[PDB]
Amino acid sequence: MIIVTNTAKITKGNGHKLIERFNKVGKVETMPGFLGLEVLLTQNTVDYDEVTISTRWNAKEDFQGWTKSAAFKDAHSHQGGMPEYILDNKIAYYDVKVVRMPMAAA
Amino acid sequence: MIIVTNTAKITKGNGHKLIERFNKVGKVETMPGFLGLEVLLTQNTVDYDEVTISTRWNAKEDFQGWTKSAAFKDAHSHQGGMPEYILDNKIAYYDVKVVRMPMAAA
């Protein structure tokens, strides 16, 4: 299982703009091996906003299949390029090593 | 929903030691409002290992309850210190803004 994160440093007060663009049903959630997408807003960022888009996959080749897909070309098409309010964008890959679920389900 | 992360930079080749310490049933899983813990290893870090412990909570008050609990206190009773391979540690808090679950492509 892997997580892929896209972390955007954003001009203060503009984080909501990037959140809005992901706050809809899309195509990535129809991809094989997709396990979920979440958008996070970092707390206590003083002079900037920080928005993280993270997707979880059963394996890296499942993510790679999406990035080569047709739907990936449409979802990254009429996007107005990199907006003015994005100061930096970092992508990272993570291996999931341990998962510990609550007792309220176990 | 919030996520609390603790990200440790660790001497390259020693990341497995922190992961192993979290690879067991603990007490945070018994806390009300707890939604899950995972341990991540960042891919393609050159000079160090990076291990992230993530806990997910229904609300910030649930995490606060945990940090006030006798369990949390006992789990940090150690007055000794820190293993020499732990180089840095940063805590971050996140508000979950969007969750997109898998959908059938039909």
Numbering used by the authors:
A (entry chain A), B (entry chain B): 1 to 106
Pull verbatim passages from the article behind this deposition.
Bacillus cereus (Bc) encodes three FNR paralogs, two of which have assigned distinct biological functions in bacillithiol disulfide reduction and flavodoxin (Fld) reduction. In this study, we have assigned a function to FNR1, in which the His residue is replaced by a conserved Val, in the reduction of the heme-degrading monooxygenase IsdG, ultimately facilitating the release of iron in an important iron acquisition pathway. The Bc IsdG structure was solved, and IsdG-FNR1 interactions were proposed through protein–protein docking. Mutational studies and bioinformatics analyses confirmed the importance of the conserved FAD-stacking residues on the respective reaction rates, proposing a division of FNRs into four functionally unique sequence similarity clusters likely related to the nature of this residue.
The IsdG monomers consist of Fd-like α/β-sandwich folds forming a β-barrel at the dimeric interface containing the conserved Asn-Trp-His triad required for the catalytic activity in the heme binding pockets. Bc IsdG was crystallized in its apo-form and reconstituted with hemin, the latter yielding red-brownish crystals. In this study, we demonstrate that the reduction of IsdG and IsdG-dependent heme degradation can be catalyzed by FNR1, as seen from our spectroscopic investigations after the addition of enzyme to a reaction mixture containing IsdG and NADPH. The reaction between FNR1 and IsdG proceeds with a kcat of 2.6 ± 0.2 min−1, the KM of FNR1 for IsdG was determined to be 2.1 ± 0.4 μM, and the catalytic efficiency (kcat/KM) was 1.2 ± 0.2 μM−1min−1. As we have demonstrated that FNR1 can reduce IsdG, the putative interaction was investigated through protein–protein docking. The selected top hits with the shortest heme-Fe (IsdG) to FAD-N5 (FNR) distances cover a large potential binding area of FNR1. In contrast to our previous docking results for Fld to FNR1 and FNR2, it seems likely that IsdG can bind in the less exposed binding cleft found in the FNR1 structure, which is narrower than the more “open” conformation observed in the FNR2 structure, with the latter suggested to facilitate binding of Fld. The docking of IsdG to multiple FNR1 sites, spreading across the binding site in a fan-like distribution, is in accordance with the interaction between cytochromes and methylamine dehydrogenase, where only an approximate orientation was needed for electron transfer.
